[PDB]
Amino acid sequence: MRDLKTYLSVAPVVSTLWFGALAGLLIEINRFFPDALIF
Amino acid sequence: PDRPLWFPGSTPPPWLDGSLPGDFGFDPLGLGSDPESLRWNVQAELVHSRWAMLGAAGIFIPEFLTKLGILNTPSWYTAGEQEYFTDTTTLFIVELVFIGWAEGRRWADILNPGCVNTDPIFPNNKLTGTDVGYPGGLWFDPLGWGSASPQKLKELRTKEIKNGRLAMLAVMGAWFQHIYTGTGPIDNLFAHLADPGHATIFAAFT
Amino acid sequence: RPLWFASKQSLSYLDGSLPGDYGFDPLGLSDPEGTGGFIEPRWLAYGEVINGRFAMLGAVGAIAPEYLGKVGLIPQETALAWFQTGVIPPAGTYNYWADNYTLFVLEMALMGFAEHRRFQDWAKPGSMGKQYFLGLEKGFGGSGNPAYPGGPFFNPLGFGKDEKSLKELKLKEVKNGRLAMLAILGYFIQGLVTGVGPYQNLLDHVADPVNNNVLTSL
Amino acid sequence: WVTFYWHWKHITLWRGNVSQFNESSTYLMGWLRDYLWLNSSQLINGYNPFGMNSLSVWAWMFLFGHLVWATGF
Amino acid sequence: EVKILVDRDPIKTSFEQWAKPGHFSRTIAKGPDTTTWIWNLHADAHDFDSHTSDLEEISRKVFSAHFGQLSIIFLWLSGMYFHGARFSNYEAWLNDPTHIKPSAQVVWPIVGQEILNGDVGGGFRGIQITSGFFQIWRASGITSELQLYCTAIGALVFAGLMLFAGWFHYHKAAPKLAWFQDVESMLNHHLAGLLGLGSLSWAGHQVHVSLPINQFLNAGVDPKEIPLPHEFILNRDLLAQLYPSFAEGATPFFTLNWSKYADFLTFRGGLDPLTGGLWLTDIAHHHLAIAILFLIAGHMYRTNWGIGHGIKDILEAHKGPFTGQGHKGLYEILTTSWHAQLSINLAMLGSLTIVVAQHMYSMPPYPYLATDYATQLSLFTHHMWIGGFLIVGAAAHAAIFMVRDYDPTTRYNDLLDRVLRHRDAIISHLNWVCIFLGFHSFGLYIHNDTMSALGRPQDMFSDTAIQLQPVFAQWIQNTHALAPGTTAPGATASTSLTWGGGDLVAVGGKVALLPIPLGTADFLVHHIHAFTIHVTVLILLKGVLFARSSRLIPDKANLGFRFPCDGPGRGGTCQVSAWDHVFLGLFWMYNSISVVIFHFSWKMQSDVWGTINDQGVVTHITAGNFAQSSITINGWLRDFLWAQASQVIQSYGSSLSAYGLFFLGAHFVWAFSLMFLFSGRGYWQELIESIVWAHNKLKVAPATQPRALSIVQGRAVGVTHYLLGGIATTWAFFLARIIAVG
Amino acid sequence: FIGSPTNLIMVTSTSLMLFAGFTLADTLACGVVGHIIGVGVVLGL
Ligand code: CLA
Ligand code: CLA
Ligand code: CLA
């Protein structure tokens, strides 16, 4: 379990989760505040 | 060390001694192999159990009285989507600050056993809970049933945790049932009692 | 001992120790060399025993309603062929007290305990006697032999008290099991080619052996 | 890039429609389609299965350049 | 004595190795000092030979790996069927295949990408697919989305089963080396059990499900109104109504009255006029016969009973005066070296994928496939690419065997040795024939360009000047066209419309197929093909034959399979490794396959595809310009590339805009590869020194020291981005073109 | 069926193949080959 957590903390997994979260965020923001060219 | 198991004929995991209330050697994924994780999972199972018991009572007791002439409260599944004296979001904010306070002090308790036993306003009042997950004091244990012999504590906490499991499963059951059938849980109970041969889950899926 | 389609490989590990040992293994499935998973001598023996017992039950169960219905001891509504009972819905259904899938869930529920425990006696023979079970664990202690548990529950009539009788009864059990398994296979293919029950096939064969035959019905 | 810029802007100037450059130069598909792809029409037709004209030299030299470039590769 | 051999629990299942990157290698497991470590971790991940010397452990690893691959593929198929059921216009397409575009992908509405959901018909908005799944599903007799759902569930289950099988056969019950080495048994089981029972049972589905349902569809009856497949099995009366043979059951089969079964087992050939595909009766008969052939073929090799051949015997029996000992020693090589096997199988599987491409263009096996030009072009191109790649791989692993496994002191073979003793002659001859081919193919094109530019078309190589007719191919065409009357009496029509003689098959106003004319242009392109293939072979074969040693580097074998060079000495020894030959061979394979798919595209759009008017007037997509245009480089530059890139370059603002985006993106990646291919890591290392200085100045220099890519990785990244770029470019070009004008 | 050209050809093929010229594998083999030759001859005529 500790080993599995360590694996989940490895660079590619961390990157997939981080950029996944970011992608989700930017997507939702661009869904609620769409076509933003100013601000 | 010597206790009935979830899977007779199997060896319980090393981290499950049996000194914990509700220990039946069930952790086939080893989600509680680490001591801290096991401990946090114990607290989480506690709060889940109690919230789910309150919930199960909260949907099954009124729905059963609603079916009689005693009450006329609407379905538990649609009790949220209705309007009240104020908007539901205001209620949700008040809930967030109040429950936020309670859960805050409880979190501080989990991360540091002693630090949250005294009342910040009136230092006279204190909590008499010895181990975490069981606050005690006058507010949470006015009958003093929380402090006793280790045997009675084991028994009572085992009852608590078991009724908790049953409650969790019951609430999940209520949710899925109202999703499928489209009526109240009591209606389902009576339908099943009326015809257990056909009026089941396959009465809609097949 | 008499041999039945044996070979050097076969006779090298089949020594007449198991009941029904005619040295028959032209593929070598029971070869003790490189064993693992489910290809293992002991497990294959146990499996033969289980498939044999169940096929003994089924070979009778598949023919009894058709027979008793052709006689008249049971009503014609329950005088259905084995494949018309609802086991294969597009071939026939019958309305029982419960739904077929519900009945299936019930079936898996009971068989779940009955089988999981039986396996637990194979993995750990000493178990199924320690854990509480309505006081039934006393008669579920096994006997050191997984396939042959005995006790008050599985052998109340105290059969096989002596060795020369026990081995003889094991032999008879294995033979009856193999015959019953071939009987089930026969039910499957005969039903798959004729379209009628196996007892009807028997009657049609007894009536006219020459005309009613496998070479005839395609 | 600089000669591409100069040449496209000036061709659009001399043609009488600077709006072409002004609108198409804001995206690279515009440079590819409206600058490169368009202005090669006559060039690649210096010679063809039907006949040839005075632009055959530049078509032949165009291909010559492509070939030499790839040999470089 | 062939038997089941297995070790019980060889490797404990634990996440402990998951938390230790590079566990498989003693070097990599220690951790990173520089960034290079990272790349190495991925480069040697599947190089099981560098992990262990033990052939058994390697074999187990590859076995479970294969299970993983199969799991992935089942998940992929599951995805295709599920998307075909939930996000498609398949039923609508069934109702009108000739005027509805196949689509099984829809996009979510954000950032404007909603525009990609185009008007594909059937009251549906989405991305038009070119995989050809719809025609397969129609051929299989599928009519509803429910059946597709069920097939999806089945495929998902099978994915689970394959994954579990991998874990099981690696961790629980892992086969012994002798088990993997039972090649006679493996061959028997794969010939009889896999292919044999495969095409047999498939013939079963075709005869019991495909034929009837397709007969109904072709009759015109609404799909929902068509009887469910199980009914044709339950009620033989229906099949009897369609094919009266079934009235006599399986009796004519056992009584050898096979003629009675001519209702559903035919040998007509050609294409079904109302579908543009091969006759399903011909296909069922084909699969039945194939099944018989493979079933009897799987009984060739000796196993646990006296009967059967021994592979080693057959090998040791073949030895001539020119070759001495002949094929002796090869069995031992091919039963101890995975790389040799991988070489052979890659070469043959690649070649097979190529023949699949050709045979699928010229003999459309699915209904409403030939008139779905997008799908046909896509399939041809796709399978061609896969083929070429697999072949290059064959070269790679041939060389890898040559370096790592070859040992003439323990596993000697005469043929290989003799090949090695005259390798100079082989390579020099291949060299010469390549130069000759290049001159006498491309030189013809340059000749034509020059004559055309100088105003001398009468001096060109064409059908209207100096002719170079494909007489031999024309003769083969004529022979194959006249075959049904002479050398294949039982055959009604030809095997393909493309042969020199015949009529014309059209479906829904579009041309399915017609006789393909061969002239000077075809002579030219075919010799280009011969040239490019010969060069690719030159590079790769030279790579494998000199992998161990050369007059330049006598001990090259000790340097390994993959290494940058042996220094600037000897004049310079860059790219001497066989790996670098795979590296160059990749570029040449790209070249060859590119000109091949261009050949296919232009020929099809020019002389085959197009619409057909009443009374028989055929108007092709590019109006037969091939014969006159494809004889100069300028013709390809203008009439093919320039003319047909129109659709891709103006695809903006429509559903095909993604193809414009991918056009540009692919061009970009392609150019981007050139930075890696044209440069060297010294420059990059020094630049990195300066940047590292800048990072140190602000206390943000990483402990894992930033390193420039290795020479080899620079090459790999280069060729990878080059291929991705070029291929994706032609991808976008092809798809936009054929979807818009098709 | 008995006495038909196909039947005679088949039974004689299987007989001649079994005669040549012994285990279960041998009988299965000779039987199958006899059937193959039989079908080939029958359909060939
Ligand atoms: C599910 C539980 C499980 C666990 C805990 C293990 C644990 C282990 N396995 Mg085992 N194994 C399993 C299931 C499991 N395996 C399954 C399902 C298979 C069949 C595939 C195998 C077949 C197998 C082989 C052949 C080998 C191991 C090995 C190992 C050991 C080292 C592997 C490692 O740490 O890298 C962990 C690897 C990863 C985290 C990467 C997973 C790669 C996936 C499966 C490939 C598919 C990804 C796909 C391309 C997606 C790409 C998308 C896009 C980005 C391109 C470790 C003890 C190795 C060993 O024992 O060496 C001595 C070894 O050689 N396993
Ligand atoms: C039949 C299938 C097959 C199998 C099982 C193998 C197996 C192997 N190959 Mg071989 N090979 C094959 C086909 C195969 N190859 C083909 C078709 C080619 C021609 C390209 C080659 C050419 C080749 C070379 C030149 C080399 C190998 C090597 C190897 C060994 C190490 C592989 C490794 O660990 O890399 C790990 C896997 C990767 C790093 C995968 C990444 C590859 C690129 C980056 C993916 C391409 C991008 C993709 C198409 C789209 C990307 C989209 C998006 C992510 C941007 C391993 C034994 C190496 C070796 O040393 O053998 C001893 C070696 O040097 N192979
Ligand atoms: C498009 C540019 C280009 C050209 C023209 C060539 C040409 C050649 N390459 Mg290739 N090559 C290229 C790109 C090119 N390459 C790239 C980008 C790479 C990196 C992947 C390679 C990597 C590579 C490898 C690995 C190999 C080759 C080989 C060859 C030779 C093959 C034999 C042949 O056909 O000779 C015939 C010559 C031609 C087809 C060129 C045109 C001939 C003209 C028309 C004749 C002109 C007449 C006269 C000479 C004019 C003189 C006028 C003057 C006196 C004023 C040939 C010289 C192979 C080789 O050497 O085998 C023998 C070989 O193995 N090259």
Ligand SMILES: CC1=C(/C=C/C(C)=C/C=C/C(C)=C/C=C/C=C(C)/C=C/C=C(C)/C=C/C2=C(C)CCCC2(C)C)C(C)(C)CCC1
């Ligand atoms: C002497 C003796 C005897 C007798 C014996 C015998 C007489 C035997 C026989 C046997 C036999 C007589 C056998 C047979 C077999 C056969 C088989 C086994 C067959 C098979 C077939 C097949 C496999 C087929 C196939 C196919 C198909 C299906 C279709 C296509 C074509 C073909 C043909 C390929 C006895 C015992 C009385 C006693 C002792 C002495």
Ligand code: SF4
């Ligand atoms: S590869 Fe780089 S280093 Fe090796 S020789 Fe060629 S140039 Fe010198």
